[PDB]
Amino acid sequence: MFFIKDLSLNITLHPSFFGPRMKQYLKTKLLEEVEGSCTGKFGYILCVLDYDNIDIQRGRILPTDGSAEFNVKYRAVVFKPFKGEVVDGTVVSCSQHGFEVQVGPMKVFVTKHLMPQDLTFNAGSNPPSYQSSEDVITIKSRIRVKIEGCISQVSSIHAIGSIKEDYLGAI
């Protein structure tokens, strides 16, 4: 799911950037340290909105580091997965332990036990694929997956999905 979130970050500036154009460096650091990053609390931080109007507060010199610590408030578009949510994606990898679906910046892992019984793994075909009477699931195929679990770490999110329920699977 895509949300527009109000986020805060603590950025550190090396003393080498204590010049008349330090605010630009803070903006560059924000786009280089936040955009594309993953946080278990807010999901994948994708894009920073209103790049011209970030609120840069007064910086605090750290006692022994000598660097300035800036609190930065910004508005960003973040993708956060939730268990029980249904998403669409493209299969990127297939193996004996199931296939992986790519949904935006996230990869959902579908285990065999979360697949319908008829589906079976066929390593003989190149590329390997899951074959059943009605459909074939392979790399680049489009699958509707229901996220069954999400484990969020401070800098990583991994989810497991299922295609057993009705109206799921190959699109």
Partner 1 sequence: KEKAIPKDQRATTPYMTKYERARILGTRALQISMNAPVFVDLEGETDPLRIAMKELAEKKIPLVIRRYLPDGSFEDWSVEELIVDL
Partner 2 sequence: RRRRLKKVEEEENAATLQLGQEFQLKQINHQGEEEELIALNLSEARLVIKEALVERRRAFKRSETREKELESIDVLLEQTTGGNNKDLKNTMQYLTNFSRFRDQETVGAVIQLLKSTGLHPFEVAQLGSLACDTADEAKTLIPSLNNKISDDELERILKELSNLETL
Partner 3 sequence: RCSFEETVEILFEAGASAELDDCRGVSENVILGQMAPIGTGAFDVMIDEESLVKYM
Taking the complex as a whole, how short is the minimal distance between the CB of residue 10 and partner 1, in angstroms? 17
Residue 32, SS3?
A: helix
Binder to partner 2 among 93, 102, 131, 138 (CB under 8 A)? 102
Q: What does 123 bind: partner 3, partner 1, partner 2, none (CB cut-off 5 to 8 Å by kind)?
A: none
Q: Which stretch binds partner 3 (CB under 8 A): 20-28, 89-97, 110-118, 126-134?
A: 20-28
Contact 151, 90 (CB under 8 A): no
Residue 35, SS3?
A: coil
Measuring CA to CA, which residue among 83, 77, 84, 98 is closest to residue 34?
77
Contact 83, 106 (CB under 8 A): no
User: Does 69 help bind partner 2 (rule: CB under 8 A)?
Assistant: no
Contact 145, 108 (CB under 8 A): yes
Q: Which stretch binds partner 3 (CB under 8 A): 19-27, 87-95, 110-118, 152-160?
A: 19-27
Residue that the structure tokens 């973040």 belong to? 78
* Cβ proximity to partner 3, 22 vs 31, nearer residue: 22
Neighbours of 129 (CB within 10 A): 20
Q: What does 23 bind: partner 1, partner 3, partner 2, none (CB cut-off 5 to 8 Å by kind)?
A: partner 3
Contact residues for partner 3 (CB under 8 A)? 18-20, 22-23, 56, 58-61, 63, 68
